[PDB]
Design a binder for this molecule. Structure first.
Ligand code: HEM
Length: 153
C-alpha cells in the first residue's frame, strides 16, 4: 500500500514516538477520550475518570498508552506484512472489546493531532502523508477482518 520511501518516512517519524512512548501514548488516549467521550465507556478501568486532570494523573492510563503504541509500533515495523500481528488484534477488538471501526478512525486522527502538537514544525507534509497512509492500511486490514466476523457495527 506504501512505497519503501514512504515506509522510510513512517519509521523516521516512529523514532520520535519511541523517545517517549508513555507521554505519546497518554496524550493519544486523552485526545481520544476528551474528543469522543463515548470511547471511554468501552474501558471499565478508565470510565471512572471524569476530568482531563484525573486522566493526566492516571498512571494506569499511561501504562495502557504504552501497551497500545508498543503493539502499533510492532505492526508498523512489519511494513504491511503484518497479518500475523494484526489478526489477534482485530479478533479481540471485534468480539471481546466490541470496538466499532469508527473508534479506530478516531484514534488514527488522534495520533496525527498529537504528533503535530508534540512536534510543531517537524512533522512535515511528506511525513504526515506517509503516516496517514500507514494508519489507513492498518484500519483497512482491520475492516477486512471485521467484515468476516460480521461485526456489522
Ligand atoms: C491504535 C489502535 C489500537 C491498538 C494498537 C490497540 C491495542 C490494544 C492491545 C494490545 C490491547 C490488549 C490485548 C487485547 O486485549 O487485545 C488492547 C486492549 C483493549 N483495547 Fe485496544 N487498541 C487500539 C485501539 C482501541 C480503541 C480505539 C479502543 C476503544 C475505543 C480500544 C479498546 C480496548 C479495550 C476496551 C481493551 C481492553 C483493556 C483492558 O481491560 O486492559 N482499543 N488494545
Amino acid at each position: 500500500g506504501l512505497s519503501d520511501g514512504e515506509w522510510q518516512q513512517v519509521l523516521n517519524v516512529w523514532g520520535k514516538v519511541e523517545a517517549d512512548i508513555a507521554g505519546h501514548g497518554q496524550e493519544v488516549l486523552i485526545r481520544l477520550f476528551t474528543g469522543h467521550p463515548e470511547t471511554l465507556e468501552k474501558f471499565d478501568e478508565f470510565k471512572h475518570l471524569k476530568t482531563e486532570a484525573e486522566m493526566k494523573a492516571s498512571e494506569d492510563l499511561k501504562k495502557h498508552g504504552t501497551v497500545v503504541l508498543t503493539a502499533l509500533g510492532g505492526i508498523l515495523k512489519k511494513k504491511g506484512h503484518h497479518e500475523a500481528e494484526l489478526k489477534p488484534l482485530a479478533q479481540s477488538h471485534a468480539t471481546k472489546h466490541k470496538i466499532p471501526i469508527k473508534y479506530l478512525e478516531f484514534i488514527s486522527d488522534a495520533i496525527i493531532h498529537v504528533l503535530h502538537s508534540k512536534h510543531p514544525g517537524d512533522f512535515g507534509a511528506d511525513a504526515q502523508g506517509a503516516m496517514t497512509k500507514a494508519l489507513e492500511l492498518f484500519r483497512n486490514d482491520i475492516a477486512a477482518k471485521y467484515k468476516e466476523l460480521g461485526f456489522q457495527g
